[PDB]
Amino acid sequence: GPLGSNHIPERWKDYLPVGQRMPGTRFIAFKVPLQKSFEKKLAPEECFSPLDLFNKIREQNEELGLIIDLTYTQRYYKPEDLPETVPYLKIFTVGHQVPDDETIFKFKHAVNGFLKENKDNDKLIGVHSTHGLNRTGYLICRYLIDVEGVRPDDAIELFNRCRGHCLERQNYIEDLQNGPIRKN
């Protein structure tokens, strides 16, 4: 039958796989984990599977309570294949424009619903895009700004320090700093 796609996304090898939990929040960021079909294109040290993700999370003494997947370009992993049964939500975040208001609303709604169902624990919301940096950083910071009243640059700096890489997209940064609070 037909060939599946298995290309390593551009620059994916270049980022630390998993960030630190952001203190004062229940967010953690990471780049997309890659299922086994991708690994023949990777050296052993470059591999980062869904198992590796759960192992790194456990290593940091945390636990994921929800994964939010922002990716759309290819199939990277099957939620059915997550070696742990953790709730999963896709929110396609497409293109380089500032994530649209419909997308921002879906992200807040997912986070708020998670927190409401999980007041009694410290499980985290794991968010990933391809690099777990730009679309991920935007949405996490936009949440902290609109919902928790965090100063935009404080959100960015906390996101960056915990991720291990700085949010790159200049239009994302400018909207976080100077754009409107979106309706909740």
Per CB under 5 A, does 171 bind Cl ion? no
Q: Tokens standing for 16?
A: 């630390």
**Min CB(116)–Cl ion separation in Å:** 28
Which of the ranges 71-79, 80-88, 107-115, 171-179 carries the binding residues for Cl ion, by CB under 5 A? 71-79
Per CB under 5 A, does 134 bind Cl ion? no
Of 25 and 130, nearer to Cl ion (C-beta) is: 130
E strand intervals along the chain: 27-30, 64-69, 88-90, 124-128
Of 98 and 145, nearer to Cl ion (C-beta) is: 98
* Interatomic CA distance for residues 56 and 62, integer angstroms: 9
**Min CB(61)–Cl ion separation in Å:** 30
**Min CB(150)–Cl ion separation in Å:** 26
* Interatomic CA distance for residues 154 and 169, integer angstroms: 17
Of 72 and 112, nearer to Cl ion (C-beta) is: 72
* Interatomic CA distance for residues 34 and 24, integer angstroms: 29
Positions 101 through 130 that interact with Cl ion (CB under 5 A): 130
Distances from the Cα of 117 to the Cα of 66, 87, 110, 113, 162, angstroms: 11, 12, 11, 6, 25
Binding site for Cl ion (CB under 5 A): 71-73, 130
